[PDB]
Amino acid sequence: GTQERVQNSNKKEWNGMMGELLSGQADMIVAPLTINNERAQYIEFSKPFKY
Amino acid sequence: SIGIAVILVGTSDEVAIKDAHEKDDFHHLSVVPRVELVAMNETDPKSIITRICDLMSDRKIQGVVFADDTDQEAIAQILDFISAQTLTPILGIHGGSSMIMADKDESSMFFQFGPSIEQQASVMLNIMEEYDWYIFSIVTTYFPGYQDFVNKIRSTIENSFVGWELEEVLLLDMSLDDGDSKIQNQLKKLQSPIILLYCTKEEATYIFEVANSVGLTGYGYTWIVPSLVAGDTDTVPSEFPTGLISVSYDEWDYGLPARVRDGIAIITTAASDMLSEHSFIPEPKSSCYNTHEKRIYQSNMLNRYLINVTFEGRDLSFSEDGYQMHPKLVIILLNKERKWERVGKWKDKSLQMKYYVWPRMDDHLSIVTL
Amino acid sequence: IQNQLKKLQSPIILLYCTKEEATYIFEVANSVGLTGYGYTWIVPSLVAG
Amino acid sequence: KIVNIGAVLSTRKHEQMFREAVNQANKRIQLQATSVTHKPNAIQMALSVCEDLISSQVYAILVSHTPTPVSYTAGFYRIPVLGLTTRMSIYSDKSIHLSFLRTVPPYSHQSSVWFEMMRVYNWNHIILLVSDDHEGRAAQKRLETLLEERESKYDNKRGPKAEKVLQFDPGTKNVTALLMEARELEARVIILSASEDDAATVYRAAAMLDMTGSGYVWLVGEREISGNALRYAPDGIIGLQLINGKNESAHISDAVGVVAQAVHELLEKENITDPPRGCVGNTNIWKTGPLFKRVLMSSKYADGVTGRVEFNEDGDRKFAQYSIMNLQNRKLVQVGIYNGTHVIPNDRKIIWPGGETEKPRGYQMSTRLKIVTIHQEPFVYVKPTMSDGTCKEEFTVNGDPVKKV
C-alpha cells in the first residue's frame, strides 16, 4: 500500500491493506508490515516485533 | 410564448439600447421570443417592485435580466426575494445587482455573474504556484463566509503533490475597542513571507493601519486579498500599500453590452432546450397579487437546464446555488502611483500572465548559464 | 525612527541612550512589536535612573 | 423631540400593550409608538411596511408570527429591526441581513446545553444525525465549534470527540441505511437535530431496528419533542425547554426598554439625522445606522421579565435560561433547569431509555475484530483447504500440532 495520484488529478489515495484499514474496511493489520514515517501519519504502530 | 424582459435602472447607458437587438440569432433555436426593455432614474425599493411586478402580465413576459450601478450590498436581496414569490428566473448582470449572496432561499431561482469565494481561493493558489511562493499565512476577521475560505484552502492544500506549506491562521475580533491592543497582540506573532487576508474594506483600512503600526506593511510582506476588499476600482484608500494584489472581475474585461449579450443569449437558449424534448411550453404566469404556485412543477423543470448551457463555443454553464461555473476572471495590481493595473487574466482553469518575472518596489540578481 | 527601527531581527539587543530616549524608544518599540518576549534587552546604568 | 417606532403583529391586543408599555417607562424627548396589522400573500407585504412606517420617523420595527419581507426592505436604509417570534438560524448572517436584533435565541444555540450534559454525566462519545437544509449545517457547525475546545495546553484528562456525522436528506422516504450503518459503531449516544417529519420518520425507524433499548441515549431539540414528535417518541427521551416560551406579549415590554435605554445615549448630539419620510428615492442612507446600532447592541438592560438582557457579539439574545425536560413514555415532565452557566437538574424520576434506572455508559467496546493479511511465505503461509471444508491437520518436527484458521 502507498499513496498515488488518481483521476488524472492530485487527489491522494492509498492501496491494498493500508487503504483497507484507513477506509475502516479492516481493523488491524496482523501481517509483515514495515514501519516508516509516511505511514505513521495516519495509523498507529505497535512496538516492533521483529527487527 | 415565453416573454423576456430587461431593466436598466439608474445608469444612463443609451448606447446599449441599440444593442439589445443583437438577438437576431434566436431563429437558430426557435422559441418565440418577446423582448421588452425599460430604463429608470435612480430610485427606491417600492419603485423597483411596483415597476417590476406588472411587466410579466402586461406583455406576457416570463423572465427578466437586471443591471444598474449602485451599492451592491442590498439591491440584490430584493431581487432574490421577488425570485421566490413567482418562480421566475432573474439573471442579475451588472454592478449593484451582481453581488454574490452566499446562501439564499432554496426554493428560489436567481443567478449572478461573479466568482464565489472558493474560486477566488483557487485562483490565489494558482498564482502562488506560477510565481512559486510556497509559505503563506491567513489572517481573518469574523466576517461571514470565512469558514468556507479557510476550508477551501486547507482542502486543496492536502491533496496536491506540490510541496505546499502553511503557517498560523489567525481569527481576530473587531468587536470592542478594548481588543484593539489585543488585535495588536494577536498580530505580533506572524513571521511569514507571503500573507493572505479576508475582511471588508473598512476592516482592511483598520488592519493595514495597525499593520503599519507593528511593521507589517512594507516590503518583505506581499499581500493577496479577494475582490470584496477592493471596492470601486478607483477610490483607493491611503493605507493600501503598493503592489497589493487582488483577483477581480471588472468592465476592463468587457462592456455592458457584452454582458447584456450573454444574458440575452442564455434565456433564449435554455428556454428553447427545455422545449427540445418535452412538449410543455411554460405559460405566461400570473400577477403579483396572490401566491398561486399551481404551475410550480415546471419551475423545477426550468432549473433542469438553466444550469448547463454553452453558446458561441463559450460555456455559460452554472453551479447550483446561483453563480456561473466557469467565471472569466482577471487580476489587478496596485501601482506605485495609486492605480489598479490589469496584470494578467485567468481562464480555462489556466493562467495567461503578462510578466515572466515579478517586479518589485538591490539583492535580486539575474544570472546566465548555458 | 519607526522606519529605521523596522529592520532589526535579532534575538538579543543592546541599547544606548538616556532615560527619556529610553521611554520614547521602548514606546515606539511597543508600536513596531519590539518589546515582548523574544527580545531580551541590556542597557547600561545611565538609563536606569 | 418626536420619535416613532412601529410593529407588524397579528394581535390587536398587544398593539395597545406596546403603547402602554412604552408609556410606562416614558416617565422614568417624546418617544411615540406606531403599529400595523399583518396580512397574507407576502407579495403585498412589503407594499405595506414602507408606506406605513418609513412615512413616520421610525428608529426600529417589531415583527412577529413569519419570515416575511420585513427583513429585507427596512434592512435597506439600514434601520435596525427587532425580532420577536421566529428563530431559525438563518438570521444570524451579518451579511445577509443587517436588520435583525432578536429576542428568542436561535435553534443552533441550543447546542450549548448539550456540551454541558457531556460533562455532568461524563459521556465522551457521540453519534450525530444532522439535517441537510441549513439549520443542521449551522447546528453541527456550532457544536463542532465547542468540541474542538479543551485542547490541553484539565491537567491531562480525557475529552469528548465526534465519531460519525450522518447527513440524511430533508425530504426522505426510506432512511434505514443510515441507521443500519450507525449501530455498527460503538457508542449509544444519539443527537437528532431536525424538523417534525424529519424526526417522525426517525423515531418510527429506530425502535423497529431496536436502536432504543437499554444503554441508549437521546438528546433532542425543541422542534423534536413537539407536536408530531409524540406519535413515535422514544420513551426515555431527553429534550429541552427554555423559560421564555413562545408568548408574544411576554417581552414586547422588555424590548421597549432597550430603545429607551438608548435614546438618552443617542442624545449625544455628535451627528444625528432623521429617518427620511416617503419611499421614493432617498437613495443613499445613513441614520447613524452603524452608530445607532453600535449603541443598541452594547449593554442595554431590557426592562423585562428576564434579568440582565444583553446582546451577544452578533445580535441575538444572550444568557437565556433553559429547563431540562424529559419523558416517561407519555408525559413530558421537567427534570431540571438550565441557566447560563447554571446546569441545574430537578428532583424527579429519570426513567432512562429502556426503563432501566441506571445511568448507562455511552460505550460498548466491540469484540469480533476483523484482520487483514497478505501471502508471505516465512510469515503467513497460504494453502488450500481439504475438500470436506476444514483443512488438513499437521504435526511439526517434534510432532506438536500446528494452529490453522
Side-chain angles (χ1 to χ4, degrees), chain A residues 1-4 6-10 12-51, chain B residues 1-25 29-33 35-41 43 45-50 52-58 61-70 74-105 107-157 159-185 187-188 190 192-218 220-250 253 255-260 262-263 265-276 278-282 284 286-288 299-300 302-303 305-309 311 313 315-335 337-338 340-341 343-346 348 350-353 355-359 363-370, chain C residues 1-3 5-6 8 10-36 38-49, chain D residues 2-11 18 21-23 25 29 32-38 40 42-64 66-86 88-93 95-101 103-108 110-115 117-134 136-140 143-152 159-160 162-163 165-172 174-179 181-187 189-197 199-203 205-222 225-230 232-245 247 249-253 255-260 262-264 266 271-276 278-299 302 304-307 309-312 315-328 332-333 335-346 350-355 357 359-367 369-385 387 389-405:
Chain A
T2 184
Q3 271 160 342
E4 61 176 1
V6 290
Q7 314 171 328
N8 315 66
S9 164
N10 310 323
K12 282 302 182 77
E13 191 52 17
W14 306 83
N15 293 321
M17 45 157 59
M18 164 85 62
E20 285 206 19
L21 180 54
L22 290 176
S23 297
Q25 181 55 259
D27 197 319
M28 199 170 318
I29 297 167
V30 177
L33 180 81
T34 176
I35 279 189
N36 48 2
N37 194 354
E38 285 71 37
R39 313 170 206 249
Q41 291 155 346
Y42 293 92
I43 213 168
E44 174 69 0
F45 278 164
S46 48
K47 285 302 189 146
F49 65 96
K50 182 80 193 85
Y51 299 180
Chain B
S1 176
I2 175 165
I4 285 156
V6 182
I7 285 188
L8 307 155
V9 159
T11 305
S12 42
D13 303 308
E14 273 68 356
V15 193
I17 279 297
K18 177 63 48 162
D19 310 342
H21 291 212
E22 196 197 336
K23 64 152 185 159
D24 43 345
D25 179 45
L29 316 175
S30 282
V31 158
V32 193
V35 163
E36 182 182 83
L37 321 167
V38 59
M40 189 175 309
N41 298 262
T43 55
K46 176 186 75 64
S47 160
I48 304 180
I49 175 60
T50 70
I52 281 176
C53 75
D54 310 341
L55 287 193
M56 286 140 268
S57 63
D58 316 317
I61 312 305
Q62 297 291 111
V64 305
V65 171
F66 211 92
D68 79 297
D69 167 46
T70 325
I75 177 59
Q77 269 76 356
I78 305 304
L79 288 201
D80 199 323
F81 191 94
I82 306 316
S83 71
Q85 298 307 111
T86 308
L87 311 188
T88 42
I90 292 188
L91 313 190
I93 50 146
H94 199 29
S97 174
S98 180
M99 193 44 50
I100 298 310
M101 318 178 56
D103 286 25
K104 66 209 181 203
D105 184 336
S107 48
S108 126
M109 66 299 295
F110 170 71
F111 317 81
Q112 298 172 346
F113 278 18
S116 59
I117 174 166
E118 309 84 342
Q119 284 139 303
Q120 311 209 357
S122 353
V123 167
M124 295 179 164
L125 279 198
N126 269 293
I127 284 312
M128 307 199 70
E129 286 179 20
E130 172 66 86
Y131 302 145
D132 305 58
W133 303 289
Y134 281 134
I135 301 91
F136 53 87
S137 304
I138 293 163
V139 190
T140 315
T141 84
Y142 194 80
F143 192 84
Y146 74 121
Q147 312 196 136
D148 315 325
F149 195 66
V150 193
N151 292 1
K152 171 62 178 193
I153 288 175
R154 273 173 186 161
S155 154
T156 79
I157 209 183
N159 288 20
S160 159
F161 183 39
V162 178
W164 289 119
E165 281 67 38
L166 195 45
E167 270 202 357
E168 313 85 344
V169 191
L170 315 193
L171 172 64
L172 315 178
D173 201 341
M174 298 313 180
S175 40
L176 314 95
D177 313 345
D178 294 330
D180 169 53
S181 87
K182 151 184 208 179
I183 291 300
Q184 168 163 0
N185 291 11
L187 280 189
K188 284 201 173 201
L190 308 175
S192 158
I194 311 309
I195 280 188
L196 313 194
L197 157 59
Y198 183 77
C199 76
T200 126
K201 184 176 179 293
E202 307 75 16
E203 303 324 286
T205 55
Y206 195 121
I207 287 175
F208 277 98
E209 154 65 30
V210 193
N212 175 49
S213 86
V214 286
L216 302 201
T217 40
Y221 293 146
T222 317
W223 290 63
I224 301 176
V225 69
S227 82
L228 288 64
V229 165
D232 194 317
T233 325
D234 49 3
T235 75
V236 53
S238 177
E239 306 80 333
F240 289 13
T242 73
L244 172 55
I245 310 166
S246 177
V247 193
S248 160
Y249 174 88
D250 65 352
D253 307 333
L256 191 64
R259 321 296 91 206
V260 172
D262 305 338
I266 276 181
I267 205 168
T268 319
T269 254
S272 293
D273 320 313
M274 200 197 77
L275 264 297
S276 47
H278 313 185
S279 314
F280 188 32
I281 280 173
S286 89
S287 45
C288 60
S299 81
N300 300 113
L302 195 152
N303 288 41
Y305 321 94
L306 269 296
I307 314 158
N308 189 219
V309 157
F311 164 75
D315 172 29
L316 297 195
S317 304
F318 283 73
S319 162
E320 206 291 324
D321 59 324
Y323 64 98
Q324 73 205 32
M325 198 61 103
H326 298 233
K328 164 195 176 193
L329 323 184
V330 306
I331 296 92
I332 68 190
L333 168 56
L334 184 54
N335 199 325
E337 55 200 357
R338 318 298 295 216
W340 296 107
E341 321 269 354
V343 309
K345 64 178 188 173
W346 177 102
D348 299 330
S350 43
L351 284 157
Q352 310 183 34
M353 321 300 297
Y355 296 173
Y356 287 68
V357 192
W358 206 235
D363 298 335
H364 172 280
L365 314 167
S366 78
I367 60 189
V368 196
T369 79
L370 168 61
Chain C
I1 291 300
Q2 168 163 0
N3 291 11
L5 280 189
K6 284 201 173 201
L8 308 175
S10 158
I12 311 309
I13 280 188
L14 313 194
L15 157 59
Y16 183 77
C17 76
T18 126
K19 184 176 179 293
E20 307 75 16
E21 303 324 286
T23 55
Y24 195 121
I25 287 175
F26 277 98
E27 154 65 30
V28 193
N30 176 49
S31 86
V32 286
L34 302 201
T35 40
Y39 293 146
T40 317
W41 290 63
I42 301 176
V43 69
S45 82
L46 288 64
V47 165
Chain D
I2 284 192
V3 169
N4 289 319
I5 293 171
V8 52
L9 320 155
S10 195
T11 82
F18 176 70
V22 61
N23 214 2
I29 41 180
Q32 309 158 344
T34 44
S35 276
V36 57
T37 173
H38 182 37
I43 305 101
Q44 71 156 327
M45 184 43 69
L47 292 197
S48 318
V49 57
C50 206
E51 283 61 23
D52 298 359
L53 280 186
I54 308 304
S55 312
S56 317
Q57 300 294 141
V58 284
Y59 285 72
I61 292 186
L62 306 152
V63 60
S64 129
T66 317
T68 61
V70 197
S71 39
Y72 285 145
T73 294
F76 195 66
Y77 297 182
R78 291 163 175 259
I79 316 176
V81 169
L82 281 179
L84 299 201
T85 289
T86 308
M88 289 269 185
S89 190
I90 198 171
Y91 289 137
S92 194
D93 289 79
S95 90
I96 281 283
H97 308 314
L98 282 158
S99 62
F100 278 175
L101 273 179
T103 43
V104 283
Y107 283 21
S108 69
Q110 83 177 342
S111 196
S112 318
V113 172
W114 290 334
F115 181 69
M117 308 294 105
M118 302 189 191
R119 209 165 55 256
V120 78
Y121 286 118
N122 287 64
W123 309 336
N124 304 350
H125 304 274
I126 56 180
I127 279 185
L128 194 34
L129 263 64
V130 312
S131 196
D132 211 358
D133 169 25
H134 184 174
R137 308 261 75 80
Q140 151 174 345
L143 181 50
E144 204 158 20
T145 313
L146 284 190
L147 297 194
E148 59 83 20
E149 293 284 344
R150 321 196 51 238
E151 298 177 354
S152 314
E163 285 67 23
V165 282
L166 297 203
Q167 322 193 11
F168 65 96
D169 280 347
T172 298
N174 214 17
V175 77
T176 83
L178 297 157
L179 289 203
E181 71 169 344
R183 187 196 42 248
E184 320 309 286
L185 299 99
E186 58 92 20
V189 158
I190 289 176
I191 295 177
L192 171 79
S193 87
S195 45
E196 325 183 344
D197 171 60
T201 71
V202 173
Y203 290 166
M208 70 190 180
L209 206 48
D210 206 327
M211 284 293 296
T212 173
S214 197
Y216 275 121
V217 156
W218 302 72
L219 321 179
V220 306
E222 191 166 33
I225 52 176
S226 48
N228 282 315
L230 301 190
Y232 302 97
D235 38 358
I237 205 180
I238 292 297
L240 302 201
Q241 280 310 275
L242 190 72
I243 72 168
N244 294 24
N247 179 297
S249 160
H251 41 101
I252 320 181
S253 42
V256 171
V258 195
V259 57
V263 288
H264 292 347
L266 183 145
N271 192 320
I272 319 300
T273 317
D274 288 330
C279 193
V280 256
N282 308 57
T283 81
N284 54 354
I285 306 290
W286 180 27
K287 311 295 102 179
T288 70
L291 263 296
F292 174 36
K293 180 210 202 74
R294 172 56 182 262
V295 190
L296 205 55
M297 78 154 182
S298 307
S299 197
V305 306
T306 72
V309 177
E310 308 203 25
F311 277 162
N312 58 359
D316 272 308
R317 176 83 165 81
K318 195 215 271 205
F319 284 158
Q321 189 162 8
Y322 286 97
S323 183
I324 302 197
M325 188 76 143
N326 180 0
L327 168 83
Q328 304 167 356
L332 305 164
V333 54
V335 183
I337 167 173
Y338 167 61
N339 181 30
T341 175
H342 295 347
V343 51
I344 302 172
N346 204 39
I350 306 170
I351 297 184
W352 292 84
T357 320
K359 179 178 139 291
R361 308 200 286 107
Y363 198 81
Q364 194 49 72
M365 164 194 316
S366 197
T367 67
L369 311 197
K370 308 201 308 169
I371 317 289
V372 56
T373 65
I374 178 54
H375 175 234
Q376 200 80 337
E377 207 71 10
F379 290 92
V380 179
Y381 282 103
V382 169
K383 302 296 189 189
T385 183
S387 89
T390 175
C391 68
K392 202 184 304 176
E393 297 83 330
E394 183 53 32
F395 313 98
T396 175
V397 173
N398 303 343
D400 320 328
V402 156
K403 309 183 279 295
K404 305 191 169 178
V405 309

